Design a protein around this ligand. Sequence first.
Ligand SMILES: CCO[C@@H](c1nc2cc(-c3noc(=O)[nH]3)nc(-c3cncc(Cl)c3)c2n1[C@H](C)[C@H]1CC[C@H](C)CC1)C1CC1
Ligand SMILES: [Cl-]
Length: 96
Amino acid sequence: GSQIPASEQETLVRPKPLLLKLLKSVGAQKDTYTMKEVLFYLGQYIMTKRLYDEKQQHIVYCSNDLLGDLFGVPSFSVKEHRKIYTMIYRNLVVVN
Ligand SMILES: CCO[C@@H](c1nc2cc(-c3noc(=O)[nH]3)nc(-c3cncc(Cl)c3)c2n1[C@H](C)[C@H]1CC[C@H](C)CC1)C1CC1
Ligand SMILES: [Cl-]
């Protein structure tokens, strides 16, 4: 988190189909998103589908959800920031 630049939030991205499917269940459908948007929408999606909770030792549990299929893990810590960006980057392309 400390070594992640604030400029990351401005990266412009095109979600691959499965990630786009998830995003469209929580936000406006667009072709190009910022990473700020993707993180916000994923966070709301997680909360909405109860994949994360108080006192779960900061773990998101996604094995019963399409998110698990996108990310290819059954669970992950919200504290593992660089791993989160890697799992996200597998499901989008950067637009420049
Ligand atoms: C309103 C809902 O909030 C979500 C949330 N909780 C967090 C706690 C900490 C955190 N980091 O260190 C600690 O000790 N805690 N970090 C992030 C975080 C923020 N931005 C980028 C990155 Cl990579 C991580 C947190 N998020 C993000 C919005 C959320 C973004 C989507 C990502 C796939 C999973 C995390 C909950 C999961 C549903
Ligand atoms: Cl699902």
